[PDB]
Amino acid sequence: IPEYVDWRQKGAVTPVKNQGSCGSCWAFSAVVTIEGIIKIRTGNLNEYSEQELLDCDRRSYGCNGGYPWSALQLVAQYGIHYRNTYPYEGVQRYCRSREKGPYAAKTDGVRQVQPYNEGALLYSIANQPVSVVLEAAGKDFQLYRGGIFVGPCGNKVDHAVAAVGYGPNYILIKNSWGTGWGENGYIRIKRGTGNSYGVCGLYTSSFYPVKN
Numbered sequence: 001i002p003e004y005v006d007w008r009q010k011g012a013v014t015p016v017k018n019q020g021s022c023g024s025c026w027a028f029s030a031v032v033t034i035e036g037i038i039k040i041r042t043g044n045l046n047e048y049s050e051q052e053l054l055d056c057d058r059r060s061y062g063c064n065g066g067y068p069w070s071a072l073q074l075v076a077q078y079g080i081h082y083r084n085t086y087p088y089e090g091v092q093r094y095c096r097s098r099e100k101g102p103y104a105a106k107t108d109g110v111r112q113v114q115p116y117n118e119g120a121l122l123y124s125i126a127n128q129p130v131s132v133v134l135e136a137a138g139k140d141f142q143l144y145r146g147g148i149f150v151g152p153c154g155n156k157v158d159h160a161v162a163a164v165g166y167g168p169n170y171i172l173i174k175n176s177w178g179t180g181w182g183e184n185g186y187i188r189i190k191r192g193t194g195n196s197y198g199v200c201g202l203y204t205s206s207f208y209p210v211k212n
């Protein structure tokens with residue numbers, strides 16, 4: 001795998017989104033990985049529905065939080081609609097996936113990266129954008145403006161985001177806090193520190209969709 005990866009340069013990343021006050025990050029992270037793998041497999045970059053996962057993932061909890069793995073399982077089992085078809089509303093509502101016609105895209109499964117293993121995550125990101133979790137509660141992270149973030153942060157992961165690239169000393173993260181946070185909505189988090197958890201627990205729980 002290469003020394004630099006940046007799925008934005010390969011046209012596999014849609015514009016940065018803002019989840020608002022709703023605890024819907026698990027869905028934004030999952031959707032990022034679906035947008036990426038659909039671009040990788042088909043050549044088309046589309047936006048897919050975070051709102052659909054909020055409403056329809058019966059194993060997540062809407063705006064009270066959820067599981068990127070559960071949302072990716074849902075996209076593999078049923079599918080997902082285009083964002084413009086099922087736009088983000090910032091509130092959980094009833095599942096409307098049936099009333100909106102056929103699903104726009106569908107995947108074939110979901111994998112987990114070996115946890116607490118930096119190289120396994122780098123391999124996965126070299127293949128595609130990956131759903132990852134981290135500790136975002138620390139004000140150092142909340143207030144991040146740019147540069148390669150080294151912390152301070154603990155391993156108390158509470159926030160799902162998406163890894164869309166990496167470099168020698170960092171992993172490139174698409175956050176769901178709008179384009180005004182960090183580096184136009186992105187954060188570069190230092191890697192290679194030898195702490196198995198990753199900076200801010202970045203290696204705790206990483207999933208990606210499978211699409212043949």
Ligand SMILES: *[C@@H](C(=O)OCC)[C@H](O)C(=O)N[C@@H](CC(C)C)C(=O)NCCC(C)C
Binds near residue numbers: 065
């Ligand atoms: C993420 C979010 O939107 O926070 C941004 C301010 C949610 O709080 C969330 O779903 N967190 C998630 C942690 C990752 C996805 C493992 C979580 O705790 N999910 C379990 C659901 C419930 C027990 C909170």
